[PDB]
Amino acid sequence: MDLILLMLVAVGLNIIDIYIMIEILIMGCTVNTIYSASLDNDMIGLIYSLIQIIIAGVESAIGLSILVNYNRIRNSEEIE
Amino acid sequence: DHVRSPNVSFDDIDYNNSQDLHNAQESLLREQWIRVSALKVCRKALESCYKTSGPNHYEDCREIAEKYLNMLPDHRIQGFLGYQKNDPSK
Amino acid sequence: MLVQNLIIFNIIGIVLLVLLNNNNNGILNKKSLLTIKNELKLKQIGLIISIINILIIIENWIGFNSNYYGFQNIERFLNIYWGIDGISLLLVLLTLILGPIAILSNWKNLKGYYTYYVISINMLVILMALNFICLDLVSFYILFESTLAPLFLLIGIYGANNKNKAAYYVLIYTLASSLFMLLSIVIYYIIINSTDYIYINNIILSINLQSLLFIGIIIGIAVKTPLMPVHTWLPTVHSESPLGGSILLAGVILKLAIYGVIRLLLPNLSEISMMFTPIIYIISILTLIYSSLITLKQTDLKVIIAYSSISHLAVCMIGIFANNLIGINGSLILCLAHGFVSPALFILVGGILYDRYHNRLINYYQGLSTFMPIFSIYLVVFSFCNTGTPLSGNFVGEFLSITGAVIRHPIIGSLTAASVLLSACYQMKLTNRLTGSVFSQYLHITNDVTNREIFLLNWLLIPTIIIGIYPSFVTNILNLASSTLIYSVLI
Amino acid sequence: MIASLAGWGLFGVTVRAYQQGIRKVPFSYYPLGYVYSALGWVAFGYGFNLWTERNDKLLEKRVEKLKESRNLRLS
Amino acid sequence: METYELIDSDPKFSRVVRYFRPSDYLTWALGTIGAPGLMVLFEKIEPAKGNTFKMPPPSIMRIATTIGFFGGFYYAYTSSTKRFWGYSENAKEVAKDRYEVKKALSEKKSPYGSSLLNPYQQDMSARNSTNSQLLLAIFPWFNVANHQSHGIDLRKYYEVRDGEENWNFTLPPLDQVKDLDVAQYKEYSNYP
Amino acid sequence: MLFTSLLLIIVYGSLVNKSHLLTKLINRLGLIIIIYTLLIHLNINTLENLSIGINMFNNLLLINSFNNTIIELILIICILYVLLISFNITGLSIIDNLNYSKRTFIVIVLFNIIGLTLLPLVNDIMILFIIIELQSYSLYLLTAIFNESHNSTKSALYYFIVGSIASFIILDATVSIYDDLGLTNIQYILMYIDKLEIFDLLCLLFGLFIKIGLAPFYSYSITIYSLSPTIITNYISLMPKLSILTLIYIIMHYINIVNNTDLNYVISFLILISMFIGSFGGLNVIRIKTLLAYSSLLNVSYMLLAILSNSNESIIAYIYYIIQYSLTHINIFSIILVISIYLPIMNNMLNVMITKYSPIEYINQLKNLFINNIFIAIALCISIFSLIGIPPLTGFYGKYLVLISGLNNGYVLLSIVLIIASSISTVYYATILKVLSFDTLSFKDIISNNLIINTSPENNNNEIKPEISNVISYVISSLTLIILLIIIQYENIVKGAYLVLLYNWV
Amino acid sequence: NSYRAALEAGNGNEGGFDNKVIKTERQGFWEGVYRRPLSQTVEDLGEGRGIITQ
Amino acid sequence: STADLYGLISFTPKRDIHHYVIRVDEVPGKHFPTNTTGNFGNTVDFENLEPRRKPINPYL
Ligand SMILES: CCCCCCCCCCCCCCCCCC(=O)OC[C@H](COP(=O)(O)OCCN)OC(=O)CCCCCCCCCCCCCCCCC
Ligand SMILES: CCCCCCCCCCCCCCCCCC(=O)OC[C@H](COP(=O)(O)OCCN)OC(=O)CCCCCCCCCCCCCCCCC
Ligand SMILES: CCCCCCCCCCCC(=O)OC[C@H](COP(=O)(O)OCC[N+](C)(C)C)OC(=O)CCCCCCCCCCC
Ligand SMILES: CCCCCCCCCCCC(=O)OC[C@H](COP(=O)(O)OCC[N+](C)(C)C)OC(=O)CCCCCCCCCCC
Ligand SMILES: CCCCCCCCCCCC(=O)OC[C@H](COP(=O)(O)OCC[N+](C)(C)C)OC(=O)CCCCCCCCCCC
């Protein structure tokens, strides 16, 4: 019951909700990596996980920076 | 002046040597126009014989006309690609 | 050095015509001597160059041997080998002669931009001329599609009311089809590793792979020469295209397809041609019969001649696919004969009548012999030449092509004789109507044929009669070259 | 190689000439632009014919290793 | 291909700068003053403002020199490196390298030098900096450590070539040179 | 050279005042930085010594003669691109002041160039997922450089969201490969090419397919390109494809080791659909940037046919195609950025709103270009004719070489479709050429002082004042003749393509 | 059946052509030859309009 | 000659799971940051290492 694209119902109906879903999806790839690194007793995989957390952090900032500028644009009249 | 025909049968050459393959194509052509010319001379006799004989042209030109009809089907330009690209022995 | 002289001279000539005219754009108003008298000093340069190109081929003609087998004047320019044989000599010669007549036909019936028009005509003439003197399938294609760029722009800029409709038709019909020829050219380059003529003439391919190559190439040929049922682009183009475009289009461009059969099909796909020859005859003969019945029920003046050219290009294809020297020689002579009579008709129909009365509806005109006697004289003569009169060059082409078909297939090839009757119906019905009954009430009496218009007709009529009366000027050159295409084994 | 370099030098001149038509100015405007363009495209010409001459020495040596490999298949 | 003798597959930063031919400094000289010149030439080709020539601000002529300086060094750095790898003529350099390496061996000192890095870190610093010059255009990285993964056989410094017998060098066997792999693991095979 | 001077420009950028003259001169320093990088790169990198492939930085990056060429291609296109902002394109301040307001425009470009060049060189999944982000982020920042605009910002937000999804798809595939094998380096993975799940490399490509805008993901690329300013769309519609099509080719080179038949069918399904959508898509459109966006999709479709076939003829076809389509794309967007000075001015109907970000937005704004500037129109016609495929322009050999590699590997269906989509596409390239010239003679006698160029004052009325800047006109002239006159050097240039090697050797 | 797969199995034309080796068995789809047995032409083209007879 | 040159270059040698190019020029694990000899599973001895697979540069 994922082949019916059920997850789209679970997403909210705002742009900020789309941002959340992406970060949840990227977090799924880190938990899988930590699962793989620990079982193999490999510290190379845990380095990958650290990079995924750091890189996905930057992407969050750039997304909200664009959204904040975009939201400011509508209320950018500044007449007074 | 009057350059001759370099008689070269395809079965003697290897087609890779392009200069040879050109000779075997040209030679097969130049021996086919000679047969057409010999047809014209043979038919040039049939016309003169027919007129001079008059009513006798069924007997005084019998062999000439017979030979002309026998040689007519195959005394025409046939080209080299027919025999170049085919091997009759198989 | 033919090609090296030919390309360089025109490239030099194009730059000369570019420099003189476009130097005066600047910021200043066009008060210039060159554009005085409708750019007369820039048209004359263009007319001189098209005459000079004729002198280039003649320089290499006197060295040409009519007895040596193979390609002559073999030269490597731009990493491409260029050669001339018996067939390529006459088609290049014919192409260059139509150069000056195309320019001279539109000498004083354009609204402007004569410099652009002149350069476009020369580029079409040179690229067509270069197309017969290449030596590989790839180079054949390059000069077979480069003409689209000037031809698409020439029709759109200098066209009739429906030029937009026709500009698409010439561009897309000749590209959506010739692309199907690019596939077959590419297949040769993959399995043989070269597209050179002599290299691929000696290689036999499997029975299936010849059919796949034949279809890909016949598709690009059956469109370039209008053959049913993909003939529905030429009549539109001929109606809308300018007089210079119509002269070159039905004079040389449509003959490229006949020459395309010689280079791309007969030698290297020889076996499959014999398999396709009965199919070609059914397609061609129905093209002849239909395109002559369709012409009966037409109305437009220039469209009527457009369908006439299709019928006389079906006779060429019937003759060329015959497997004998009689069919092949007559098919080539007819292309040469049709290279002068067909352009001449467009001068009468779309270059004299249209340039004065500015209409193309056959209902208006009748009885033009009353006040235009000289126009009628060339109308009747070029009508009887176009129908296959014995003293014309069309008859020699039409007799040998019909006789060549009968030798290959005596039963279905007999239907090729329909061209003798059908060409008389639609053609004379035009000539009978244009020169019959009282002078039309819709047309005012105007100037008769001028000196310029007389000149073109006299220099498009004489080559037609000369070939008709004594075609040995043409047959002797072709006899060696045409004998190579024949494929037959007699035991 | 002077035969080849002159070809590029002419090609560089034509670019400058074609540029004037873009800018809508008479072709006799600031003639030095033709010399500068000719020198520039000769410099690219010199560095091009070297690149082609350098290729030929590379390609033939790679060809030799290819013909040996073909003879193994042709055996 | 125009190969030569492979002096050092991973030349050290201090040795690359040392082996700068006089032409190499000239290249660095051009690049340091070429960048201010190119800014001037650009104004000649088309001015930034107006339709007339105007020399760029003196402040820009200062930063452009800095870009040219750090830009022209790498052209010198890359030119010298190709002589070590064997991609460029190195007859002059081979003479210099063999003299120093022979001098190092003669004095019972390592050719590479003493290091502050344990045997793993030497190996690690080899992989990071080796062939880094192939990306020196994109971003800098240099071999600043005294490691030993230089991809050579030290016995090629033992045999005497032409024109070297005059130096009168005596070379001990490799098992007695300080700071080498063969002369370090004498007590424990795990530790140097 | 990039890293050392990019930091210098970042510090120097904010130290000096914000003035369009200082910003423009700083942009020129960006041009000088890129030029030095090319000289330094060409000096140390050769095709002869990189044929084997040389590992760098602990085997994180691997460079060979194939990735090396694209790096040289990326740098050269950027040099021509920076000429659009380092020099005047039109001359009039109103339309050219948009390129000089943002100081960090050149800085962001240099951030992207570092990302662009290193992406083909990735040899480990850890550095793949990083380098794709360094390039991907630089695109989102670039699309939002003009934050006053409403369309440019909404483009970047739409671009950020889809690009993040593509990054997650790419990230997930690399984690899946890591979970099966436990290894990271691609060369280590090659040992286990027969035992990992091969479709996980396809899931990796599906991420890269999104970023270059391949159907069915084409929807966002057309929208984004049609909205961003013309100065921005010229860079984001070409550069990401240069540095990703090369990476796709390297991955496809690895995948063809096993020669999975199921994987070819899935990719061929995408190739087949893209030619359909890229051809029928542009038939009914009014915007010029939307048309070129559909043209980009179709020419990406043609290149991917060569990549999928992936034989020794693919390298010759792909190397030649990527170079010629890049110059042509630069040539067209250079012309469209210059012919904005012939627009008419009102003195209404349809209330058509034209903004200073995209002065040329509809195709019918090219009318009478044959009249206004005939030499420019011929350059535009030649560029358009190349994309059509009129021989012997550079475009013709691009399709001729793709068909050779496509047919050599048995892609008979896709080859026939590629030709049909080449014929269908010709309709909406001829529309551009119809607009320019087809009404020349009906408008030869026109009274019109209402052009944008006519606003500039007359300086002397005696001296000859050229209508266009020197540098931008020369680039158009240099690229126009390369496309038209490639027939001379084609045999030699193709020989240069023979020498490019990707583990062919013998 | 593609040319590449056929070429790698010896069904292509990599080693050039020769005309003394006349193959009785029908050639492959992609294979090319200089010369062919007459009986194959008779099977394909059929006797008639110039093959063997006139 | 032009046909023979293109025949050689355009040929694509078959690669399968048995023969393909791996650009690994050494063996990992000679030195580890800490605890170099772990479970004593690292059997490969670098003192007696067999010669590696050198790449074949075709231009040399
Ligand atoms: C309690 C159970 C709970 C299970 C949770 C899921 C419930 C089922 C939800 C729908 C399932 C449909 C997909 C089924 C799995 C995906 C297909 C698959 O993996 O194969 C299974 C099935 C048969 O496979 P089989 O032949 O047995 O393979 C054996 C090989 N040794 O393959 C099939 O033949 C299935 C038929 C699919 C073909 C028709 C549907 C495809 C066309 C519509 C697709 C929708 C649009 C997608 C467009 C793609 C976008 C480009
Ligand atoms: C002799 C040589 C000639 C060469 C060309 C020969 C082939 C030409 C084919 C033309 C035949 C169909 C065209 C004319 C039929 C009219 C189609 C149409 O108008 O749509 C009808 C239908 C909806 O009806 P309606 O919108 O009301 O239209 C009424 C018009 N009287 O809407 C429909 O039914 C549309 C059908 C759905 C579209 C399916 C598209 C699938 C692909 C079709 C081919 C496209 C090329 C694909 C490959 C290239 C791209 C990858
Ligand atoms: C045989 C080998 C030829 C190779 C060289 C070709 C040179 C082309 C001309 C360049 C100069 C130019 O673009 O100039 C433009 C010229 C001349 O315009 P005009 O009417 O005099 O301008 C007058 C302007 N007034 C009225 C304001 C003063 O017109 C042309 O465009 C005609 C020739 C090219 C048309 C088609 C080009 C597409 C080619 C596609 C691949 C074949
Ligand atoms: C108003 C103006 C309209 C246009 C008018 C037409 C102008 C004609 C100009 C003639 C020039 C000429 O003659 O050039 C000739 C020279 C010399 O040739 P070579 O070096 O010996 O090469 C040998 C050539 N073979 C082997 C065919 C003989 O080659 C050139 O320079 C080549 C032109 C540049 C080609 C473009 C690609 C190069 C960069 C690569 C980018 C991918
Ligand atoms: C000595 C060997 C090096 C050659 C020079 C190379 C750089 C050119 C700098 C010259 C000075 C300059 O640009 O001067 C400015 C001139 C003229 O400008 P204008 O258009 O008349 O503007 C008006 C100027 N007034 C007011 C003085 C009249 O512009 C040119 O010449 C433009 C030529 C374009 C560059 C050609 C080089 C192409 C190289 C291609 C490599 C891929």
Residue numbers in the entry:
A (entry chain K): 1 to 80
B (entry chain p): 3 to 92
C (entry chain M): 1 to 491
D (entry chain d): 1 to 75
E (entry chain O): 1 to 192
F (entry chain N): 1 to 347, 365 to 523
G (entry chain Y): 163 to 216
H (entry chain h): 123 to 182
What does the paper say about this structure?
In the hydrophilic domain, two electrons are passed from NADH to ubiquinone [typically ubiquinone-10 (Q10)] via a flavin mononucleotide (FMN) and an extended chain of iron-sulfur (FeS) clusters, forming ubiquinol, which is reoxidized to sustain the electron transport chain and reduce O2 to H2O. Here, we report the structure of isolated CI from the yeast Pichia pastoris (Pp-CI) and identify distinct closed and open states that resemble those of mammalian CI.
In contrast, the presence/absence of the flavoprotein appeared not to cause any other changes, so it is likely unstable and simply prone to dissociation during purification, reconstitution, and/or grid freezing. When NUQM is bound, the enzyme adopts the canonical closed resting state that has been observed in many structures of CI from both prokaryotes and eukaryotes, whereas when NUQM is absent, the enzyme adopts a more “open” resting state with an increased apparent angle between the hydrophilic and membrane domains. The open state of Pp-CI observed here is an intermediate-level open state, with two elements in the membrane domain (TMH3ND6 in its π-bulge conformation and Tyr156ND1 flipped out of the E-channel) and the region of disorder observed in THM1–2ND3 (that facilitates NEM labeling) in open-type conformations but retaining the intact Tyr141ND1 trigonal junction (with Cys52ND3 and His107NDUFS2) and closed-like loops conformations around the Q10-binding site. Direct correlation of structural data with functional data showed that only the open state of isolated Pp-CI is sensitive to NEM treatment, consistent with a disordered section in the TMH1–2ND3 loop that carries C52ND3.
